[PDB]
């Protein structure tokens, strides 16, 4: 690759060696999660040089008993450097919490979901700050909310929907803390990392930071937060609008549309999945093909949706991942959101000429959505696949739109200039109604059952929320009806799942009421940050009447 690469740490490189040994030692019916080995930290007082030398003696297939003894002796385990934290603003039953939820069974369930913020609340241990080089966990200034289970660290875009839920939970200090943490990542690296781990320094994630700041500010009117956030949001904005992230698509009327793609600064196996990734690339002839494929994999991770037919050139063929060729609808929704957020914030802070720069920017991206992304026949917005490398501008071609149907195709409904357009909303409602994405438990993320997790039969919390929120803001009766119907489907199914398992799941199998989803490279995970956040946010928006059942026995097609 001629393209840019952010180096990793010697620790991460070493821990991949441990990972490879482990995935070879265990029987195929007991293979562990590879991520757990890159989350280890070095047990004092031994240096990395000492532990690597001892690992070399050990490996010079290691039996499972010998390997576990080695790992127990030289490492503190995964997550041991991430400490439980009692959130200062947590209250077991906040006054006025979900007062519009009059179904007492539902409100008590939501209180239990609210209670899970304590489980997800952590603080990076002091050991990390005093000797950061011994941990892959990154130091952070404030306590975090994590997604849960194997996601032993704060993630970027999950934090938005977590924050939406924290605001229902009346936890505005914890919410600001998340923003403070991500702001410190932008300060250090120039972008917000995929997550607060050493092996994520090479990529970002969908740019939700401005939206987090906006949603908090809209409640607390925290002017200091906005003032602190503006220069960091400007850094983030230039990051997405320069270098390999920026592409130019020229339309038939002569307008150059400046848009973004994902682009991880990495061209190797992801350390956290190093064994899986080396295997999946084993079939490529040249090193250059492998490096291109690895960049496309790590870019699909940067998309927040690893993995999906959405990023494959010949779906469902995983080896055809091609994420750096995709100008994605949802990424550019978030960048439109950033331009609107930053214009609002500079108006608030009293920078009128700055606010005009981003009004001009948002109108220009609004033009790009009408020309580059919209597809009138489909009634939705389509990812745009590049013909070339993205170095130089290219001319828009209708055949380069991905006509496959995804929940992300409806992401622009989240933007107020779109959901304010009655005629457009009507077309989108019809397209969503007729797409096949609306399933018993919510909105399918795609229509292809690939075995990947960001595909049918799964639906995902962030994707439900953006469509429900956007549709619910239009003045169109059919849209507000559709949003509430989807929100109650999603709530109900998550409750039915919880009634069985006592846990909230990462993703739902939305083709069936009350089933969680799976697929992909790791087992279904529970917690779960954005899933808790959307459950609570939907309940605050819609409530739940006392006489409306949440149980599976009743299946009304009429609402109350
Ligand atoms: O398996 C390694 C990958 O894990 C992550 O993908 C997850 O991270 C999400 C969103 O930010 C989770 O909350 C979500 O449910 C997963 O899809 C990570 O983001 C990737 O970088 C890792 O390669």
UniProtKB/Swiss-Prot annotation:
Record has Transmembrane as a keyword: yes
Catalytic activities: alpha,alpha-trehalose + H2O = alpha-D-glucose + beta-D-glucose
Keywords: Cell membrane, Cytoplasm, Glycosidase, Hydrolase, Membrane, Nucleus, Stress response, Transmembrane, Transmembrane helix
Active site per database record: 306, 506
Enzyme Commission identifier(s): 3.2.1.28
Pfam families to which the protein is assigned, alphabetical: Trehalase (PF01204)
Protein name as it appears in the record: Trehalase
Organism encoding this protein: Arabidopsis thaliana
């Amino acid at each position: 690759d001629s393209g840019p690469v952010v180096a990793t740490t010697k620790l991460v490189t070493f821990l991949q060696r441990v990972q490879h040994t482990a995935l070879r030692s265990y029987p195929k019916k007991q293979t562990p999660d590879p991520k757990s080995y890159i989350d280890l930290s070095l047990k004092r007082p031994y240096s990395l040089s000492t532990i690597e030398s001892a690992f070399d003696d050990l490996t010079s297939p290691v039996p499972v008993e010998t390997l576990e003894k080695f790992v127990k002796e030289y490492f503190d385990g995964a997550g041991e450097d991430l400490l439980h934290h009692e959130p200062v603003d947590f209250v077991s039953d906040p006054s006025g919490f979900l007062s519009n939820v009059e179904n007492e069974e539902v409100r008590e369930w939501a209180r239990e979901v609210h209670g899970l913020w304590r489980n997800l609340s952590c603080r990076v241990s002091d050991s990390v700050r005093e000797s950061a080089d011994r941990h892959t966990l990154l130091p952070l200034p404030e306590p975090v909310i994590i997604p849960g289970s194997r996601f032993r660290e704060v993630y970027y875009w999950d934090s938005y929907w977590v924050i939406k839920g924290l605001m229902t939970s009346q936890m505005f200090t914890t919410a600001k803390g998340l923003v403070t943490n991500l702001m410190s990542l932008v300060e250090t690296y120039g972008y917000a990392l995929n997550g607060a781990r050493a092996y994520y320094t090479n990529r970002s994630q969908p740019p939700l930071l401005s939206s987090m700041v906006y949603e908090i500010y809209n409640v607390t009117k925290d002017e200091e937060l906005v003032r602190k956030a503006i220069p960091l949001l400007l850094k983030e904005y230039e990051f997405w609008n320069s270098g390999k992230h920026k592409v130019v698509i020229r339309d038939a009327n002569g307008y150059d549309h400046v848009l973004s793609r994902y682009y991880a600064m990495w061209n190797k196996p992801r350390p956290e999945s190093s064994v899986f990734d080396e295997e999946s690339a084993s079939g490529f002839s040249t090193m250059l093909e492998k490096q291109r494929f690895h960049r496309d994999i790590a870019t699909a991770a940067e998309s927040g949706c690893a993995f999906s037919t959405r990023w494959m050139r010949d779906p469902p063929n995983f080896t055809t991942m091609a994420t750096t060729s995709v100008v994605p609808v949802d990424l550019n929704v978030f960048l439109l959101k950033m331009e609107l957020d930053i214009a609002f914030m500079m108006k608030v802070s009293g920078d009128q000429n700055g606010s005009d720069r981003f009004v001009k920017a948002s109108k220009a991206r609004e033009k790009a959505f009408q020309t580059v992304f919209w597809n009138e026949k489909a009634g939705q917005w389509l990812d745009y696949w590049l013909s070339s490398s993205g170095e130089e501008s290219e001319t828009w071609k209708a055949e380069n739109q991905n006509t496959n149907v995804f929940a992300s195709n409806f992401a622009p409904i989240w933007i107020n200039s779109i959901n304010s357009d009655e005629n457009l909303v009507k077309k989108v409602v019809t397209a969503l109604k007729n797409s096949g994405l609306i399933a018993p438990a919510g909105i399918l993320t795609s229509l292809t059952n690939s075995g990947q997790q960001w595909d049918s039969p799964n639906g995902w919390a962030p994707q439900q929320e953006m469509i429900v929120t956007g549709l619910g803001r239009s003045s169109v009766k059919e849209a507000k009806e559709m949003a509430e119907d989807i929100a109650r489907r999603w709530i109900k199914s998550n409750y039915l799942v919880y009634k069985k398992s006592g846990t909230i799941h990462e993703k739902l199998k939305v083709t069936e009421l009350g089933e969680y989803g799976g697929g992909g490279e790791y087992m279904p995970q529970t917690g779960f940050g954005w899933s808790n956040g959307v459950i609570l946010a939907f309940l605050e928006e819609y409530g739940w009447p006392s006489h409306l059942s949440i149980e599976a026995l009743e299946h009304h097609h009429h609402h109350h």
